[PDB]
Curated annotation (Swiss-Prot):
Protein's UniProt name: Green fluorescent protein
UniProt family annotation: Belongs to the GFP family.
Impact when changing residue 143 to F: In Sapphire/H9-40; exhibits a huge Stoke's shift, with an excitation peak at 399 nm and an emission peak at 511 nm. In Azurite; shifts the excitation and emission spectra to shorter wavelengths and increases quantum yields compared to BFP
Annotated effect of mutating residue 101 to E: In mut1.27; shifts fluorescence lifetime from 3.03 to 2.85 ns
Annotated phenotype, changing residue 220 to G: Suppresses the 399 nm excitation peak, leaving only the longer wavelength peak at 475 nm
InterPro entries given in the database record: GFP, GFP-related, Green_fluorescent_prot
Effect of residue 143 to H: In mut1.3; shifts fluorescence lifetime from 3.03 to 2.78 ns. In mut1.5; shifts fluorescence lifetime from 3.03 to 2.72 ns. In mut1.27; shifts fluorescence lifetime from 3.03 to 2.85 ns
UniProt modification remark: Contains a chromophore consisting of modified amino acid residues. Maturation of the chromophore requires nothing other than molecular oxygen.
Purpose: Energy-transfer acceptor. Its role is to transduce the blue chemiluminescence of the protein aequorin into green fluorescent light by energy transfer. Fluoresces in vivo upon receiving energy from the Ca(2+)-activated photoprotein aequorin.
GO BP, sorted A to Z: bioluminescence; generation of precursor metabolites and energy
Keyword terms, alphabetized: Chromophore, Luminescence, Photoprotein
Effect of residue 77 to R: In Topaz; shifts the major emission and exitation peak up to 20 nm
């Protein structure tokens, strides 16, 4: 049978993202608008910086800026924690260790507001080197992929995940970002605790030729597997 929360994602769902960030005392805000279609695991979004000068590369913010839009194959639907927590939603927490540099710590609440999926985020970054790859803006703006490895966290009625992102440096090298993640439902009802599996993710960053504010256009595909 079709799950309650699963039925909320059969079609195109509008998305709003709101992030407040503080990286080594540099404050910034990001507003995102777009849509997701979990039938195809497809997200299309436009992000705009609204306050302080964006102190970090846009690519380092992709993973923080809604895994309920993952396409879960039919044979895997009973391992989809994310949709099962809806519409009340879940809290997502991460620490993102940038190798030989600082870390982000994030807390996000993901839920429906009416028919819109909303991601509200607070982001704190510390210990970043002021001429490093992040504060020095030395990362390429193009494309990366990821495998989010998900395990059940039945103590907290949620999940844990960890994964690595390799961000291309302009010089040719790679800036590693080690992600550690926990998700806990906001409601008190039953959620699907999954067997071990992963999310295969692909992110394509682009620019709106007409847009003069600091911004990021994102096309993303997310597919459960394993």
């Amino acid at each position: 049978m079709v799950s309650k929360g699963e039925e909320l994602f059969t079609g195109v769902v509008p998305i709003l993202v709101e992030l407040d960030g503080d990286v080594n005392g540099h404050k910034f805000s990001v507003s995102g608008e777009g849509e997701g279609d979990a039938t195809y695991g497809k997200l299309t979004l436009k992000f705009i910086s609204t306050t302080g000068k964006l102190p970090v590369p846009w690519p380092t913010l992709v993973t923080t800026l809604v895994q309920c839009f993952a396409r879960y194959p039919d044979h895997m639907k009973q391992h989809d924690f994310f949709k099962s927590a809806m519409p009340e939603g879940y809290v997502q927490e991460r620490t993102i260790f940038f190798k030989d540099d600082g870390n982000y710590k994030t807390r996000a609440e993901v839920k429906f507001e009416g028919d819109t999926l909303v991601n509200r985020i607070e982001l704190k970054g510390i210990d970043f080197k002021e001429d490093g790859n992040i504060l020095g803006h030395k990362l390429e703006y193009n494309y990366f992929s990821g495998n989010v490895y998900i395990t059940a966290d039945k103590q907290k009625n949620g999940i844990k995940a960890n994964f690595k992102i390799r961000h291309n440096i302009e010089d040719g090298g790679v800036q590693l970002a080690d992600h550690y993640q926990q998700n806990t439902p906001i409601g008190d009802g039953p959620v699907l605790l999954p067997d071990n599996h992963y999310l295969s993710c692909q992110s394509k960053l682009s620019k709106d030729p007409n847009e003069k504010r600091d911004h990021m256009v994102l096309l993303e595909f997310v597919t459960a597997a394993g």
